[PDB]
Curated annotation (Swiss-Prot), chain A:
Name of the protein: Thrombomodulin
Tissue: Endothelial cells are unique in synthesizing thrombomodulin.
Entry superkingdom: Eukaryota
Species: Homo sapiens
Description of its domains: Extracellular region (481-515) contains a binding side for alpha-L/beta-2 and alpha-M/beta-2 integrin.
Disulfide bonds: 3-12, 8-22, 24-38, 42-47, 51-57, 59-71, 77-87, 83-96, 98-112
Curated annotation (Swiss-Prot), chain C:
Protein name (Swiss-Prot/TrEMBL): Thrombin heavy chain
Covalent S-S links between cysteines: 28-44, 166-180, 194-224
Region ranges (High affinity receptor-binding region which is also known as the TP508 peptide): 181-203
Effect of residue 62 to C: In FA2D; Quick-1
Active site (catalytic residues): 43, 99, 198
Glycosylation positions in this chain: 53
Effect upon mutating residue 68 to H: In FA2D; Himi-2
Resulting phenotype, residue 98 to W: In FA2D; Tokushima
Domain Peptidase S1: 1-248
Length: 113, 46, 252
């Protein structure tokens, strides 16, 4: 089983005999830069907050605790201050475009230029 | 409302010149519900 | 705020909510003094015994809020901290003297009907307004009583108390960097700041120019709204010198 030498934070999923994929619990997902690690995930405008069962809640980056113990996406574009150019809001982050319209440059999660 | 700036906007940022004047009140000649209670408290009995 | 009332919309355009990212929760109050500087209490940012030892990324500065819990999109604005500046003589290991701290925002905030900076007192205004009996106003989203939270921002007007009377109300050492306020029991009125309100501003409306000045910062007390006791605030004007030093060096 390919999962022997796997350092999966939560659980390991055997793909075949030579590969596998670390997976997470409901509500979480693999961290991009550290695929063996897990963190709260959401690609929706709103997701249930991960509060303590017996309630101090947690929200994934880019979201903020809102009413009803729900993590609402932060709209960095309408908020302002996150992007200096043309801003498009995304769930959990944002896209920021700028530079000459001829050679546009784009960023995700960070200001442009 | 004569106010004297104290900070340098280069390092302080903008806003000092118009500080203390609430857009929804002073700027609209409106007073909040308990504001007068504050002014009344400046009374100096002799 | 104990024994206060709901604030009116735009009543305190300078009120700031320091919100902790993990876990997501109210941390303290604070105030807007310009489009890039925020004032608060040092113990809100640094005081390990009370789970406070924050870095700039640990929290969010939320401006223009009314509701305590609702993410008020279209009204409130979330700013990020570039750097925290705690007074150099503040020592949590000993007391809450010089309980003050400056927070510089990464990007200037945009003012609006709900976001507007408060004034800091000058020599004359400070000596003139900070006198016993004169009432200031305190605001915050903290507890409604000693021992549970408000749905919206709370406000309460409290009278400044004569120093000697403050000094006698507690065994705790008092300094010149603080002042106290609150009704005496025979005055028939109540009100006080409580846990969660720290960092918030104690403001006064100048009868000279109609502007609102921040005379203090909610700092500490013994319990909340107790008869015979008074709430203590950081004397903003006596630390204005330090405020200027920090803003000059790190202004940009
Ligand atoms: Ca977003």
């Amino acid at each position: 089983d390919p999962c022997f030498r796997a350092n999966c934070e939560y659980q390991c999923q055997p793909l075949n005999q030579t590969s596998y994929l670390c997976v997470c619990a409901e509500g979480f997902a693999p961290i991009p830069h550290e695929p063996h690690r897990c963190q709260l995930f959401c690609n929706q405008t709103a997701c249930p907050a991960d509060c303590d069962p017996n309630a101090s809640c947690e929200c994934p980056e880019g979201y903020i605790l809102d009413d009803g113990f729900i993590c609402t996406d932060i709209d960095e574009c309408e908020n302002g201050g996150f992007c200096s150019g043309v801003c498009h809001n995304l769930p959990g982050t944002f896209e920021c475009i700028c530079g000459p319209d001829s050679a546009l440059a784009g960023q995700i999660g960070t200001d442009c230029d | 409302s004569e106010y004297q700036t104290f900070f340098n906007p280069r390092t302080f940022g903008s806003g000092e010149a118009d500080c203390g004047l609430r857009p929804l009140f002073e700027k609209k000649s409106l007073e909040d519900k308990t504001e007068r209670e504050l002014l009344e408290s400046y009374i100096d009995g002799r | 705020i104990v024994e206060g009332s709901d604030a009116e919309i735009g009543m305190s355009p300078w009120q700031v909510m320091l919100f902790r990212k993990s876990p997501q929760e109210l941390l303290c109050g604070a105030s807007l003094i310009s489009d890039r500087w925020v004032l608060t209490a040092a113990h809100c940012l640094l005081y390990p015994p009370w789970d406070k030892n924050f870095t700039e990324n640990d929290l969010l500065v939320r401006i223009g809020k009314h509701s305590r819990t609702r993410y008020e999109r279209n009204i409130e604005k979330i700013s990020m901290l570039e750097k925290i500046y705690i007074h150099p003589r503040y020592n949590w290991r000993e007391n809450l003297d010089r309980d003050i701290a400056l927070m510089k925002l990464k990007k200037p905030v945009a003012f609006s009907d709900y976001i507007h900076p408060v004034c800091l007192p000058d020599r004359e205004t400070a000596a003139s307004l900070l006198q016993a009996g004169y009432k200031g106003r305190v605001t915050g989203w903290g507890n409604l009583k000693e021992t549970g939270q408000p749905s919206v921002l709370q406000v309460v007007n409290l009278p400044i108390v004569e120093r000697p009377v403050c000094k006698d109300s507690t065994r705790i050492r008092i300094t010149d960097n603080m002042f106290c306020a609150g009704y005496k029991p025979d005055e028939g009125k109540r009100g006080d700041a409580c846990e969660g309100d720290a960092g918030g501003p104690f403001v006064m409306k100048s009868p000279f120019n109609n502007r609102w000045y921040q005379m203090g910062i909610v700092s500490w007390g013994e319990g909340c709204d107790r008869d015979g006791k008074y709430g203590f605030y950081t004397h903003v004007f006596r630390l204005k010198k330090w405020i200027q030093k920090v803003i000059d060096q790190f202004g940009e």
